[PDB]
Structure 1
């Protein structure tokens, strides 16, 4: 009791009913139904049928499908090279290797201060009426892996999204050209609830197939886990948080260092919380988070990512010499601690006055303006290469006095400072 397996609907079935399943390999399972849809059935292990399966092929990239893997782009049915199982119990393709290499997001708030690393669970922490989806959109079309031998793919999964802003994605993905490396799953709010739950399992497995059996680094974007939750919320329990676990388990470097599975799940605070109680998704926050701040949003900054509450637990693995540029951490640390103080001094100005501040504190204050204005703010079609990211850093690091530059080495300064 506890787990779930998603099975093909061969016959109409009831509730709490004894039935059989023909697994991906074989191991026959004793289970009971929980809920049903039109083609999919959920069964808790501990008539005769078989698991719902994903048509795994390199022909998945370039095509758009629904949560159950049904086509949406008007095109044909996906021709399956293999017939893999949804819940990632097929190969067990992950290694006992720590996430190491670097992935470029294009956004400097991430790439600079909270670097994303090949195989990481870096969620975006957000709320309603915030541009999180449009950040995820920007990642999908701008993401790449500078240097790596392996091809790069993106798996974009949407859950509980409305028609009007479903066409948003459909248009964006095609009119950018970044479809030819991206498998896109869409799940409508109007779509069956059981189809929502299976969506990320279809998304992750598609990436697992690609990363392992075609040795490529794959980045998965799950837009709003909260919406995944509200479908599970309504499903009718002692699986509440362990189900979440089965989703954040599927992250890291695959067997044979060539490929990778990386995640950016969006977690956002709901429209209503009392009538629809939202679980703490804190289980997903283990390798850091990317905080989106309403404060930066209200002063007209995109992307409104507050770097301070944000971090990447594995950044130090994917930065510096060879991976990026050796002065990466040197700049990051300085930019962080720099912006950190300038921001706190913004309180000190309100207390004592603009004309009562130290000249030291004023150049720190103004730095916080510059960081938000010139570094944090980038266009929606601005794909800042890691060099620029670091360079824009240096440009604003010139404003604060040199003898106040935190802990950097002279060699890092004298060479890379204008």
Structure 2
């Protein structure tokens, strides 16, 4: 009973609980069977190591501009979905992923990720959050801001929602259209009242969309997946999941031809006390780092309440330095990392020895931390700060420190750009 998989067939013939199916794969050779659960249109299988095509997504460039269900049903009101191609969703049978590392920077436009732990083409960088926090708000901002600068390959987004409230539905369905962010993105909208199975096929159909656009066309796609704790919830439940999620997080990367990529940012929250878990081990997703939405910053009323230094990007160096963003980048990042860390420490012995007993030096760091969260972290629902707006904002507030104790900034960079030497 321990066996993993969970493949999605499409109901062609009426089926029954745990009947053997033994069917398909997108190449013509198949093995293994046994139904687990189903709905009016689609069948979840699950297997071990009649009949019976794998569920396929209507593949077309005309997807862009449309708004879909977990099953890809025209939710935007318009006509049907006339498909150029028609491909297997459930981890496909395409595997368009080249054995290469991720590379070259993505401009989210928000500085607490672009400038301090940069999202890189073909990464998985989850938005580590919690109930109440504005992680959806901070997500669908970067849905209409993001781009790949100077990249010869065009850019595309796949926003995907899993079992959201039917009210916050036509919210996301409006923050697009208005901005014109839609006519660049395919949306996959799942509601809490949609058949529970739909929620489990919402990520696959999203991921499958991204792969068609990234490989068949030579594009850079970003896939945001809001509230993956609703996915874990949807799964009847656990066990024996841990491999089932690996089918999801495997589906990110740079494609063959190195002329496109699948880039992944899911949001992993936790509400308070979970039902019959508490959920989970989503730690299979963070393998390349994560970004941290914090309550501490939210509470004192700053946006986005992102906390650097708990946040991490492992592949940052593979899309940062010379002729990608700017040379000084990593060197500016080290100082703000260290200065905010060393400054966040001095908020401590402020409260242990009063605001005095605190050397002049330390008052600058103490203040830098204030300036850091005021200028650097704080950002409008919009201001699409480019890496250059971001990096210079950095120097703008790095000038509250003295020098030499800026020991992570290479003198070659201060003397080049530091607001004291043109």
TM-score over 0.5 (shorter chain): yes
Distance 1:271 1:168, change over 3 A: farther
- Give CA deviations for 1:61-99 in whole Å, capped at 9, x if unaligned: 111000011110001111111110012332210011001
Shift in Å, 1:139: 0.8
Which residue number corresponds to residue 410 of structure 1?
411
> Using the alignment, how far apart are the partners of 2:240 and 2:55 within structure 1?
21
Shift in Å, 1:221: 0.2
Shift in Å, 1:271: 4.1
Shift in Å, 1:407: 2.2
Aligned with 1:127: secondary structure? coil
Shift in Å, 1:403: 2.7
Shift in Å, 1:274: 4.8
Aligned with 1:160: secondary structure? strand
Distance 1:275 1:2, change over 3 A: closer
- Give CA deviations for 1:291-341 in whole Å, capped at 9, x if unaligned: 010000000010001001001000011101110010000100011101111
> Using the alignment, how far apart are the partners of 1:343 and 1:2 within structure 2?
45
Aligned with 1:209: secondary structure? helix
Shift in Å, 1:240: 2.3
Return 98-107 or 272-281, whichever deviates more: 272-281
> Using the alignment, how far apart are the partners of 1:207 and 1:286 within structure 2?
21
Aligned with 1:361: secondary structure? helix
Note if contact 2:55-2:90 (Cα within 8 Å) is conserved in structure 1.
no
How large is the RMSD of aligned CA atoms in angstroms? 1.2
Shift in Å, 1:30: 2.9
Note if contact 1:20-1:50 (Cα within 8 Å) is conserved in structure 2.
no
Structure 2 residues without counterparts, runs of 5 or longer: none
> Using the alignment, how far apart are the partners of 1:239 and 1:178 within structure 2?
40
> Using the alignment, how far apart are the partners of 1:271 and 1:80 within structure 2?
43
> Using the alignment, how far apart are the partners of 1:184 and 1:102 within structure 2?
24
> Using the alignment, how far apart are the partners of 2:274 and 2:186 within structure 1?
32
Q: Could you tell me the TM-score, scaled by structure 2's length?
A: 0.96
Return 330-339 or 272-281, whichever deviates more: 272-281
Q: Whose helix proportion is higher, 1 or 2?
A: 1
Aligned with 2:221: secondary structure? strand
Note if contact 1:270-1:278 (Cα within 8 Å) is conserved in structure 2.
no
Return 405-414 or 317-326, whichever deviates more: 405-414
Note if contact 1:86-1:202 (Cα within 8 Å) is conserved in structure 2.
yes
Aligned with 2:57: secondary structure? strand
Note if contact 1:226-1:270 (Cα within 8 Å) is conserved in structure 2.
no
Note if contact 2:215-2:256 (Cα within 8 Å) is conserved in structure 1.
yes
Shift in Å, 1:10: 1.8
Structure 1 residues without counterparts, runs of 5 or longer: none
Shift in Å, 1:141: 0.3
Which residue number corresponds to residue 34 of structure 2?
32
Q: Could you tell me the TM-score, scaled by structure 1's length?
A: 0.97
Shift in Å, 1:270: 2.6
Shift in Å, 1:215: 1.0
Which residue number corresponds to residue 235 of structure 2?
232
> Using the alignment, how far apart are the partners of 1:372 and 1:103 within structure 2?
23
Note if contact 2:162-2:191 (Cα within 8 Å) is conserved in structure 1.
yes
Note if contact 1:3-1:239 (Cα within 8 Å) is conserved in structure 2.
no
Shift in Å, 1:233: 3.9
